[PDB]
Design a binder for this molecule. Structure first.
Ligand SMILES: CN1CCC(c2ccc(-c3ccc4ncn([C@@H](C(=O)Nc5nccs5)c5ccccc5)c(=O)c4c3F)cc2)CC1
Ligand SMILES: Nc1ncnc2c1ncn2[C@@H]1O[C@H](COP(=O)(O)OP(=O)(O)NP(=O)(O)O)[C@@H](O)[C@H]1O
Ligand SMILES: [Mg+2]
Length: 292
């Protein structure tokens, strides 16, 4: 259990390049230098923005042991931690980056088979987190990492502000449940189907709470048939108990992924690279050897 989180010494890893930043910290590409070795192993390091006292460090550690204990092909795992004045967290480095950047940079080359499978895989990861009594609380395309173009994994979940991803009851009452996570999942699917559009673009965050109670929702993505948009809309129902369950969303997107051209309308979809077996084996042997 506690063997799943490696406590690292400052002297055995090095930050080498900034990857990006978010609400809680800054992510670096870094290098692990095993003691007694000459090799340098790439890692991703998140340094927390606010220095902490050893008293808050107990809380951070308590949670780190949980994030190091997840084991599902579609959920990322915490690997290590270094408790400096500002805490540094270590996980596997995903050279392809997050799914949001991936769909933005490939807006004109992503076919429906990929999009629907990503939706399946994200739902699978969220379903595993629910089975483990874990609520994500910040699900968005930016917190889905691309291991290979064929394999995405959820990151940066937790235990107990992105207003535009949050369920209405989260905005108003600080209520976060698995059903509010289903709301955020709906927005994430919308980001993918719009190839990374900003949700409610230009609407001030102060006024999102109002327009949701008045019944507006994110618009139907241009490539979406009504069958797909109906799923997104059910995720944004005000009564949290009416939203689909992750178990149901897996089944639904798996059905659609068996005939992706019936449910997503993409120009050039017939010419788009579909995940070939030869390409799948190659990718897995170089970057992705886990069971899946
Ligand atoms: C009340 N006060 C104010 C601030 C409080 C606070 C409490 C807890 C934590 C905390 C603890 C453990 C964590 N464990 C992992 N992670 C993810 C992660 O490291 N991401 C990465 N990206 C790249 C490299 S590492 C991650 C990675 C993989 C799967 C899930 C989650 C965390 O963010 C994480 C975490 F923020 C931070 C701050 C403490 C005191
Ligand atoms: N393990 C990783 N490998 C590669 N890139 C990563 C990894 N983890 C995070 N990133 C990237 O690091 C950048 C910042 O991530 P992070 O600091 O978690 O913020 P965010 O998730 O983008 N925003 P926020 O939700 O507010 O925290 C993004 O470009 C991520 O895609
Ligand atoms: Mg993140």
């Amino acid at each position: 259990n506690q063997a799943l989180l490696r406590i690292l010494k400052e002297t055995e890893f090095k930050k080498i390049k900034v990857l990006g930043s978010g609400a809680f910290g800054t992510v670096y590409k870094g290098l692990w230098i095993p003691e007694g070795e000459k090799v340098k192993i790439p890692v991703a390091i998140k340094e927390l923005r606010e220095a902490t006292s050893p008293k808050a460090n107990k809380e951070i550690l308590d949670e780190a042991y949980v994030m190091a204990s997840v084991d599902n092909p579609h959920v990322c795992r915490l690997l290590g931690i270094c408790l400096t004045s500002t805490v540094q967290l270590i996980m596997q480095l995903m050279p392809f980056g997050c799914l949001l950047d991936y769909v933005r940079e490939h807006k004109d080359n992503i076919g429906s088979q990929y999009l629907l499978n990503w939706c399946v895989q994200i739902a699978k990861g969220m379903n595993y987190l629910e089975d483990r009594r874990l609520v994500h609380r910040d699900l968005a395309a930016r917190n889905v990492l691309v291991k290979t173009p064929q394999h995405v994994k959820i990151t940066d979940f937790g235990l107990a502000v992105p207003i535009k991803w949050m369920a209405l009851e989260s905005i108003l009452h600080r209520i976060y449940t698995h059903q509010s996570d289903v709301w955020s999942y709906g927005v994430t699917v919308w980001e993918l189907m719009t190839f990374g559009s900003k949700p409610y673009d230009g609407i001030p965050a102060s006024e999102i709470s109002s327009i949701l109670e008045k019944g507006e929702r994110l618009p139907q993505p241009p490539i979406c048939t009504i069958d797909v948009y109906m799923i997104m809309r059910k995720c944004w129902m005000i009564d949290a108990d009416s939203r689909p369950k992750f178990r149901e969303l897996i089944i639904e997107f798996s059905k659609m992924a068996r005939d992706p051209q019936r449910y997503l309308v993409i120009q050039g979809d017939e010419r788009m690279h579909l995940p070939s077996p030869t390409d799948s084996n190659f990718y897995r042997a170089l970057m992705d050897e886990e069971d899946m």
